[PDB]
Amino acid sequence: TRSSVLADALNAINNAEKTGKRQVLIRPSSKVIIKFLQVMQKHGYIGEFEYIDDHRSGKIVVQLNGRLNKCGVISPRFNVKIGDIEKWTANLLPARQFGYVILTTSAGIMDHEEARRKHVSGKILGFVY
Amino acid sequence: GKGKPRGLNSARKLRVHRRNNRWAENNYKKRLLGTAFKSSPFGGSSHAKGIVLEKLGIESKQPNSAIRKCVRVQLIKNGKKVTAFVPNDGCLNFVDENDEVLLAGFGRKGKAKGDIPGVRFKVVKVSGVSLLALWKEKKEKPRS
Amino acid sequence: GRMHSAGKGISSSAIPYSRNAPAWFKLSSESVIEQIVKYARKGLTPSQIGVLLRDAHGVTQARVITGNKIMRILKSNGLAPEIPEDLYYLIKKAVSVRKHLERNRKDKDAKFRLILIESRIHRLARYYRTVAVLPPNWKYESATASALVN
Amino acid sequence: VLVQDLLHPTAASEARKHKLKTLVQGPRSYFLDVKCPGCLNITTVFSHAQTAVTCESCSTILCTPTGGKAKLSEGTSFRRK
RNA sequence: GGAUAGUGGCCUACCAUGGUUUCAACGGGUAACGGGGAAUAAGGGUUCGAUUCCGGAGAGGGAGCCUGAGAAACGGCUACC
RNA sequence: GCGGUAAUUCCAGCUCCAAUAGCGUAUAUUAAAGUUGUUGCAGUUAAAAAGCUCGUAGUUGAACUUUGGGCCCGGUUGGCCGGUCGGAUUUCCAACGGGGCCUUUCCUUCUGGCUAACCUUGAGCUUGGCGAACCAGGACUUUUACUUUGAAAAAAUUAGAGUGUUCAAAGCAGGCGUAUUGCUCGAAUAUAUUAGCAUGGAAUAAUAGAAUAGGACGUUUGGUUCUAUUUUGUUGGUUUCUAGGACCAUCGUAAUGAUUAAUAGGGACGGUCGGGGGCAUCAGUAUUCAAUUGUCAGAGGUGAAAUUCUUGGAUUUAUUGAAGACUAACUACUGCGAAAGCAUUUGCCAAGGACGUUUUCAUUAAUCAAGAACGAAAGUUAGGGGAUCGAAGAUGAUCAGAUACCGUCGUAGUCUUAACCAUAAACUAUGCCGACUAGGGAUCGGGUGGUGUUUUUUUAAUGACCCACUCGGCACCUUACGAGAAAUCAAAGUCUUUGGGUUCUGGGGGGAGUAUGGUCGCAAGGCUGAAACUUAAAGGAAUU
RNA sequence: GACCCUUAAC
Known part of the structure; x- marks a missing residue:
C-alpha cells in the first residue's frame, strides 16, 4: 500500500526531472510535502507549485526548472542529534558548499544549514541538490 | 524496499538476521565452534613439540614429481600423530629418528602448502637447535 | 487491492466535488429523514436505503441533503x-x-x-x-x- | 509534451479520460426527470438506476436496470437534470 | 511468627495453580571474572580486555566456626576428601 | 608455478634490492571485506524467491485541526570603510538569530500582611485603584517518542593546551634574580553506549477527549457526611447564615458537540462474463462379441524381421450389442482459477473477478515467524470397476553383450473413501503490496458516445458488426533513455546521485541435502539438518 | 539398420 506520500511525491519529481518535463502531478499532497517543496522553492530547486483542492486529499502540480539533480527521502525518519548532522551531510550531499539535508525539527521543516544557525535538530526527512 | 526491513523499530530483526547469516562465514563458524581447540592437532597453539617416529617419503602431487622428506611426529601434549615437513636440502639427515622436534604450520591455515599431499606442519627445531642452524652449519646437534 | 484476490480493479463512485448540492432538489431535509426511516422500518439496510433514495428520488446522497449519513440517522433514532x-x-x-x-x-x-x-x-x-x-x-x-x- | 498545462486541461481531454483520472473526479452520471404519457407524475430517475423505478402514482415502471445506464421504458419521455 | 543488624519465602504454619516465556523464558556452551580500556579506523564497524585502576571471588576441594567493629579469615581454628 | 642436461625460481659465487639493530617464520586477530552489507551485498541464468493461499506475533501503514498579516525592541555588524590598536564609528540598504503586542488566538485565576506595566498625576513626570522584568494559598503543567540545553565518561588511557626530559618516547613540570636579597605561571580543556531535570522546543508519529451526552462553562436557585482552626465553665462531645476538593439537583449560557469519503480497503446493488468448483444427467472411438459373407490363404508388425493369429475362416465388409476410459476437429501468443489445475449437453447448488454506481461503512490496511487449507504425477492402505495404454515380468537385432532403445503380450497402475502422502524444471527458474517513468497496435470482459452498418411480421423490444474512448486482464516489436557480467529486461528501470513498506533465501567447490538427533508419515518418504576430511578453483554470460 | 575406445612416458 501507500506508506510515504513524501516518497511518492519525491519519486514523481525525480522521474519528471530525469525525463526533462517541466511539471509533475503529485497525489495526494500532504502538508509535509508542501513544507518540503517550500524549502525546495526557497532555494530555487523547483519553481512554482500549485495546490489543487479536490475535497479528498489535495493535488500538487510543481513547475520544474532544470536545477534539481536529485531530491530524496530518508526512510525511516532517523533521529538526528546536532553532532550527527555532519555524518548525514557528508554521506548524501554531493559536496560541502551546496546541497541541503532537510530535517524536521520542533522548530519546523528546514534544511541543515538553517538548523545549524538556529541550533536545532530532530528527524531527517530527506535531501535536495 | 530492498528486502531487509527498514522500519525504525526493526533493529531486532536486523540483529537476529545478521546473527543467523554470520554462520555462513567460514571463519566465524570455525571460531565460534572452537574447531581448532577441539579438532586441530596443535589445540589452537602456534607451535608444538613431539617425537619423531618414522622417516617419510611423501610423493609430490601432480604435475610435479618429487619425494618430499617428512617425519611422522607424535605430539607430546596430545599424543596425536601428525606429519611434519623437514624443509631444507639434506635436513632429513638432521631429523633422522626419535628426536624431539618443534613444529609449526605451513602458513596455509590448515591446508597443503604446495604439491605435498596431507602435510600440514613443518620442522623448525631439532633437539633444541634450530634446523636453519644445522643447515647453515652454524650449530651442530649434541653428539653426547 | 482486493485483500483476498489478485484483482486490481479500480471501480467506485465518483463523489461530486460540491458539498451543498444539488440546487434542483425541491424537497426538504426532514422529508428525506422520514423517508429513510420508513424504508428502514421495512427492513432495508442503509445501502439499500441509499440506492432507493438515489434511484426513485432526487437524493444525491443523504449526507449532502441532510446533515448526516444514513447509518448515522438510523442509529440516532433507534433503527441501527x-x-x-x-x-x-x-x-x-x-x-x-x-x-x-x-x-x-x-x-x-x-x-x-x-x-x-x-x-x-x-x-x-x-x-x-x-x-x-x-x-x-x-x-x-x-x-x-x-x-x-x- | 515535456511542457504541459496540467492545471487547465482541455474539456475534450478531460471528458475523454476516466472519471477518477480527471483533475478533480466527478460523476459522469446524471439525474433525469421522467414522465409517463398522460399523467405527468414527474419522477426523478438516476441514469445508472439499477432498480426498476415506477412512478409514485401507480405501477408504471419507468426504467430497466442495465450494467451501465438504466434503459427507459418504451412509452415515456425524459428531461436532463 | 521465627531468624537477622535490618528489608525480604530468608525460613516455618495456607489458598489459588500463582510466577517466567518466540519482546527467546528455561535448558546447553563459553579455549566467560565484569568494567575503565586495547588493537585496528574515511564514516559505520570487527576483534580483544588473565594483567599497573575500580568492583567481585578464592587461598588444594568442600563444609563449619572462634575472636573481633568488621572474616564464614585460611602466612586463624575444626572436620572430611 | 619452477626443476625432466645453456634453470633469471633449486645448490652456490659475484652482483643487486628492501627494512635495518633489527629482519624472517608460525598461529590468531584487525583492515583489506560493499566476502555479513544499518550506512552498504546478492537471490531470472553465477549460491539463493517457500508450490500456492490464509493467518497470529513482528515490521509498516492515506489525508485533515493556527499552512498567513501588522507594530516595536536593552542584544559580535560583516560595513554607507582607518571616532573603541601599516587597521574599521547601531541610524540611506545585513538572512537580523531572538523577544514582546495586536490580528476571534487563551502562557490555568483567584487568597493578602507587599499595591508592579493602567488619563486615581505638586515644575521642560505621581501624597487613593486591575497583577508575572514581583510572591508561599488548586486535587489539575492528556500519555509518550524525538529536542536544544547540560547538575555527570573516578583517575589512568584517548584527543588535546603549556613546558629549554639536549631532541624524542616521556614527565608535569617549571620561569624569572639589585651577582646579595626573593617573587611568580602551571598541573587547562574535550557527550567516540545507553533509561532521571530542562519558566523557552509540539515539526515529525499513535489504542486521548463531547454521540443512545455521562460533555463544557458557575460567583443561577437550592439541598445533601465532613477528625473545624478561629469566639462561648468541666478536658470533650453535642449545634447555625460559614471560606473548602459534593448530584448535571436547572425558569441559565454556549455557531452547543465525531474532519475527508484516499484513482486505500470492506460491503451492497445491476447487467454481465468465464473450459473456476461440486452433484446428477446427456452425447460422440476403440476392445471384446453376436449373427452375416467373402477366401485366394493370409493378417499383424518393422529399418528388415521375428514372437503372434489363421480348416476349427484369421485379417477385411456391413443397423437392434454387456463394457470402461477419453472429450478430438472448433482450440488461439484465447478464457477462468490461489496455485495444482480446468474443454460434450442439460438441470441443480453455492462461489468469483472485472465493470458500472451522485449506494454504504469508515482506516477496517500491506506483508507476514508460529500456526492452517489446497497441492500434478507417481506411490500407499480399502471395498466397485479394469475398455485402453502399460513401471515389473518372456521373443528378435547387439553380438562382447543388450535382462536397453524396436515387436508382441502383459501384472501393478488415472473412480469412491477414516482416506493418506505433500513432492515436481510445483518455472515466469522473476515474493507480495504501492507509486512513477517511453513508444504502437491487437485481444478478452464490462461500461460510455456515435438517429454510425445490418437484421422478426422486411425498415415498431433488441441482437450482431464499425469507429472513438475508458477501466480491469492475458499477452505482444528491437543489444532502447535507464538497468545488466552479458544473455536480455514494458521491469530485471526510477540502485556509489546508494532509504516507499514488508516476508523468505544465499555467502568458493566438494563431502552433502550425507543425521549421533528430532518430528510428521501405514510405508515410500517429507521437513529440519552437521562435522571430519579434501580442494584452487567450481560456476555464469559472451567471443573465436 | 549398426558405429565401443583412445599418453604415465617431459
Whole structure:
C-alpha cells in the first residue's frame, strides 16, 4: 500500500526531472510535502507549485526548472542529534558548499544549514541538490 | 524496499538476521565452534613439540614429481600423530629418528602448502637447535 | 487491492466535488429523514436505503441533503442493526457456503472460499470490537451463525 | 509534451479520460426527470438506476436496470437534470 | 511468627495453580571474572580486555566456626576428601 | 608455478634490492571485506524467491485541526570603510538569530500582611485603584517518542593546551634574580553506549477527549457526611447564615458537540462474463462379441524381421450389442482459477473477478515467524470397476553383450473413501503490496458516445458488426533513455546521485541435502539438518 | 539398420 506520500511525491519529481518535463502531478499532497517543496522553492530547486483542492486529499502540480539533480527521502525518519548532522551531510550531499539535508525539527521543516544557525535538530526527512 | 526491513523499530530483526547469516562465514563458524581447540592437532597453539617416529617419503602431487622428506611426529601434549615437513636440502639427515622436534604450520591455515599431499606442519627445531642452524652449519646437534 | 484476490480493479463512485448540492432538489431535509426511516422500518439496510433514495428520488446522497449519513440517522433514532450490515452479509455468505459444503464435501473450492470469507469476518469483527461497535467477546461461531443471522 | 498545462486541461481531454483520472473526479452520471404519457407524475430517475423505478402514482415502471445506464421504458419521455 | 543488624519465602504454619516465556523464558556452551580500556579506523564497524585502576571471588576441594567493629579469615581454628 | 642436461625460481659465487639493530617464520586477530552489507551485498541464468493461499506475533501503514498579516525592541555588524590598536564609528540598504503586542488566538485565576506595566498625576513626570522584568494559598503543567540545553565518561588511557626530559618516547613540570636579597605561571580543556531535570522546543508519529451526552462553562436557585482552626465553665462531645476538593439537583449560557469519503480497503446493488468448483444427467472411438459373407490363404508388425493369429475362416465388409476410459476437429501468443489445475449437453447448488454506481461503512490496511487449507504425477492402505495404454515380468537385432532403445503380450497402475502422502524444471527458474517513468497496435470482459452498418411480421423490444474512448486482464516489436557480467529486461528501470513498506533465501567447490538427533508419515518418504576430511578453483554470460 | 575406445612416458 501507500506508506510515504513524501516518497511518492519525491519519486514523481525525480522521474519528471530525469525525463526533462517541466511539471509533475503529485497525489495526494500532504502538508509535509508542501513544507518540503517550500524549502525546495526557497532555494530555487523547483519553481512554482500549485495546490489543487479536490475535497479528498489535495493535488500538487510543481513547475520544474532544470536545477534539481536529485531530491530524496530518508526512510525511516532517523533521529538526528546536532553532532550527527555532519555524518548525514557528508554521506548524501554531493559536496560541502551546496546541497541541503532537510530535517524536521520542533522548530519546523528546514534544511541543515538553517538548523545549524538556529541550533536545532530532530528527524531527517530527506535531501535536495 | 530492498528486502531487509527498514522500519525504525526493526533493529531486532536486523540483529537476529545478521546473527543467523554470520554462520555462513567460514571463519566465524570455525571460531565460534572452537574447531581448532577441539579438532586441530596443535589445540589452537602456534607451535608444538613431539617425537619423531618414522622417516617419510611423501610423493609430490601432480604435475610435479618429487619425494618430499617428512617425519611422522607424535605430539607430546596430545599424543596425536601428525606429519611434519623437514624443509631444507639434506635436513632429513638432521631429523633422522626419535628426536624431539618443534613444529609449526605451513602458513596455509590448515591446508597443503604446495604439491605435498596431507602435510600440514613443518620442522623448525631439532633437539633444541634450530634446523636453519644445522643447515647453515652454524650449530651442530649434541653428539653426547 | 482486493485483500483476498489478485484483482486490481479500480471501480467506485465518483463523489461530486460540491458539498451543498444539488440546487434542483425541491424537497426538504426532514422529508428525506422520514423517508429513510420508513424504508428502514421495512427492513432495508442503509445501502439499500441509499440506492432507493438515489434511484426513485432526487437524493444525491443523504449526507449532502441532510446533515448526516444514513447509518448515522438510523442509529440516532433507534433503527441501527444489532450487527453492522457489511459484517451481516459476510456472515450470511459464510452460512450459505457452509450449508453448501455440508451437501458437497468434495467441493474443495468452496472449502477454500469459506476460509477467505471467515478470515474477512474475523478481521472485520476485530475492527468492530476495537471501535466498540460490537461488544467485546463477540465471536463469529459457525455452528450458531445461521440461527443468529437475525 | 515535456511542457504541459496540467492545471487547465482541455474539456475534450478531460471528458475523454476516466472519471477518477480527471483533475478533480466527478460523476459522469446524471439525474433525469421522467414522465409517463398522460399523467405527468414527474419522477426523478438516476441514469445508472439499477432498480426498476415506477412512478409514485401507480405501477408504471419507468426504467430497466442495465450494467451501465438504466434503459427507459418504451412509452415515456425524459428531461436532463 | 521465627531468624537477622535490618528489608525480604530468608525460613516455618495456607489458598489459588500463582510466577517466567518466540519482546527467546528455561535448558546447553563459553579455549566467560565484569568494567575503565586495547588493537585496528574515511564514516559505520570487527576483534580483544588473565594483567599497573575500580568492583567481585578464592587461598588444594568442600563444609563449619572462634575472636573481633568488621572474616564464614585460611602466612586463624575444626572436620572430611 | 619452477626443476625432466645453456634453470633469471633449486645448490652456490659475484652482483643487486628492501627494512635495518633489527629482519624472517608460525598461529590468531584487525583492515583489506560493499566476502555479513544499518550506512552498504546478492537471490531470472553465477549460491539463493517457500508450490500456492490464509493467518497470529513482528515490521509498516492515506489525508485533515493556527499552512498567513501588522507594530516595536536593552542584544559580535560583516560595513554607507582607518571616532573603541601599516587597521574599521547601531541610524540611506545585513538572512537580523531572538523577544514582546495586536490580528476571534487563551502562557490555568483567584487568597493578602507587599499595591508592579493602567488619563486615581505638586515644575521642560505621581501624597487613593486591575497583577508575572514581583510572591508561599488548586486535587489539575492528556500519555509518550524525538529536542536544544547540560547538575555527570573516578583517575589512568584517548584527543588535546603549556613546558629549554639536549631532541624524542616521556614527565608535569617549571620561569624569572639589585651577582646579595626573593617573587611568580602551571598541573587547562574535550557527550567516540545507553533509561532521571530542562519558566523557552509540539515539526515529525499513535489504542486521548463531547454521540443512545455521562460533555463544557458557575460567583443561577437550592439541598445533601465532613477528625473545624478561629469566639462561648468541666478536658470533650453535642449545634447555625460559614471560606473548602459534593448530584448535571436547572425558569441559565454556549455557531452547543465525531474532519475527508484516499484513482486505500470492506460491503451492497445491476447487467454481465468465464473450459473456476461440486452433484446428477446427456452425447460422440476403440476392445471384446453376436449373427452375416467373402477366401485366394493370409493378417499383424518393422529399418528388415521375428514372437503372434489363421480348416476349427484369421485379417477385411456391413443397423437392434454387456463394457470402461477419453472429450478430438472448433482450440488461439484465447478464457477462468490461489496455485495444482480446468474443454460434450442439460438441470441443480453455492462461489468469483472485472465493470458500472451522485449506494454504504469508515482506516477496517500491506506483508507476514508460529500456526492452517489446497497441492500434478507417481506411490500407499480399502471395498466397485479394469475398455485402453502399460513401471515389473518372456521373443528378435547387439553380438562382447543388450535382462536397453524396436515387436508382441502383459501384472501393478488415472473412480469412491477414516482416506493418506505433500513432492515436481510445483518455472515466469522473476515474493507480495504501492507509486512513477517511453513508444504502437491487437485481444478478452464490462461500461460510455456515435438517429454510425445490418437484421422478426422486411425498415415498431433488441441482437450482431464499425469507429472513438475508458477501466480491469492475458499477452505482444528491437543489444532502447535507464538497468545488466552479458544473455536480455514494458521491469530485471526510477540502485556509489546508494532509504516507499514488508516476508523468505544465499555467502568458493566438494563431502552433502550425507543425521549421533528430532518430528510428521501405514510405508515410500517429507521437513529440519552437521562435522571430519579434501580442494584452487567450481560456476555464469559472451567471443573465436 | 549398426558405429565401443583412445599418453604415465617431459
